[PDB]
Amino acid sequence: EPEIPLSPRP
Amino acid sequence: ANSYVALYKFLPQENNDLALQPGDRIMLVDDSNEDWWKGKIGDRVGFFPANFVQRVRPGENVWRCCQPFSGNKEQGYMSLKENQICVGVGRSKDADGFIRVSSGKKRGLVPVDALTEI
């Protein structure tokens, strides 16, 4: 199960 | 070329998130952002992790693992854990042999008896 992205949502 | 299936649960954490349950069928709406895609499940629209979904191409079936299977890298046999979602082309009841499936970043040959079509 990949990490949920740390990057911001759009 | 917009059809996907959710591989993993995603609980909405923020406004406009689209909740994912494994096996949900997604129509992709916007893949501008590498990390967060917009898509539609059923009556709902929102954002979700792009890495949480698997493409489903025309002709491919979606499966859930009902009986775990230990794979082998050198053979190209993919492991399946119970409730794992995977996608691939099934064959008739009459044909014998593993089928090739994809499950996110893993891919390989698997026994059809490990799977239930969803």
Swiss-Prot record, chain A:
Tell me what PTMs the record reports for this protein: Phosphorylated. Phosphorylation by PKA activates the calcium channel. Both the minor and major forms are phosphorylated in vitro by PKA.
| Compartments (UniProt record) | Cell membrane, Sarcolemma, T-tubule
* Annotated signal peptide: none
Expression tissues: Skeletal muscle specific.
Q: Which domain of life is it from?
A: Eukaryota
Q: Where in this protein does the record put region Interaction with STAC, STAC2 and STAC3 (via SH3 domains)?
A: 1-10
Q: What's the subunit arrangement here?
A: Component of a calcium channel complex consisting of a pore-forming alpha subunit (CACNA1S) and the ancillary subunits CACNB1 or CACNB2, CACNG1 and CACNA2D1. The channel complex contains alpha, beta, gamma and delta subunits in a 1:1:1:1 ratio, i.e. it contains either CACNB1 or CACNB2. CACNA1S channel activity is modulated by the auxiliary subunits (CACNB1 or CACNB2, CACNG1 and CACNA2D1). Interacts with DYSF and JSRP1. Interacts with RYR1. Interacts with STAC, STAC2 and STAC3 (via their SH3 domains). Interacts with CALM.
**What does the protein in this record do?**
Pore-forming, alpha-1S subunit of the voltage-gated calcium channel that gives rise to L-type calcium currents in skeletal muscle. Calcium channels containing the alpha-1S subunit play an important role in excitation-contraction coupling in skeletal muscle via their interaction with RYR1, which triggers Ca(2+) release from the sarcoplasmic reticulum and ultimately results in muscle contraction. Long-lasting (L-type) calcium channels belong to the 'high-voltage activated' (HVA) group.
Entry comment, domain topic: Each of the four internal repeats contains five hydrophobic transmembrane segments (S1, S2, S3, S5, S6) and one positively charged transmembrane segment (S4). S4 segments probably represent the voltage-sensor and are characterized by a series of positively charged amino acids at every third position. The loop between repeats II and III interacts with the ryanodine receptor, and is therefore important for calcium release from the endoplasmic reticulum necessary for muscle contraction.
Question: Family assignment?
Answer: Belongs to the calcium channel alpha-1 subunit (TC 1.A.1.11) family. CACNA1S subfamily.
Pathology linked to this chain's protein: Periodic paralysis hypokalemic 1: An autosomal dominant disorder manifested by episodic flaccid generalized muscle weakness associated with falls of serum potassium levels. Malignant hyperthermia 5: Autosomal dominant disorder that is potentially lethal in susceptible individuals on exposure to commonly used inhalational anesthetics and depolarizing muscle relaxants.
Q: What is the recorded name of this protein?
A: Voltage-dependent L-type calcium channel subunit alpha-1S
Say which species the protein is native to.
Homo sapiens
Q: Its gene?
A: CACNA1S
Portion of the full-length sequence here: 749 to 758 of 1873
From Swiss-Prot, chain B:
Entry superkingdom: Eukaryota
| Chain ranges of the SH3 domain | 3-58, 61-118
Subcellular location field: Cytoplasm, Cytosol; Cell membrane; Cell membrane, Sarcolemma
| Reported impact of residue 13 to L | Mildly decreased affinity for CACNA1S
Q: Relate the protein's function as given in its record.
A: Plays a redundant role in promoting the expression of calcium channel CACNA1S at the cell membrane, and thereby contributes to increased channel activity. Slows down the inactivation rate of the calcium channel CACNA1C.
How is this protein organized at the quaternary level?
Interacts (via SH3 domains) with CACNA1S. Interacts (via SH3 domains) with CACNA1C. Has much lower affinity for CACNA1C than for CACNA1S.
Protein name listed in UniProt:
SH3 and cysteine-rich domain-containing protein 2
Organism this protein belongs to: Homo sapiens
Provide the organism lineage as a comma list.
Eukaryota, Metazoa, Chordata, Craniata, Vertebrata
Task: Give the fragment's position in the full-length protein.
Answer: 296 to 411 of 411
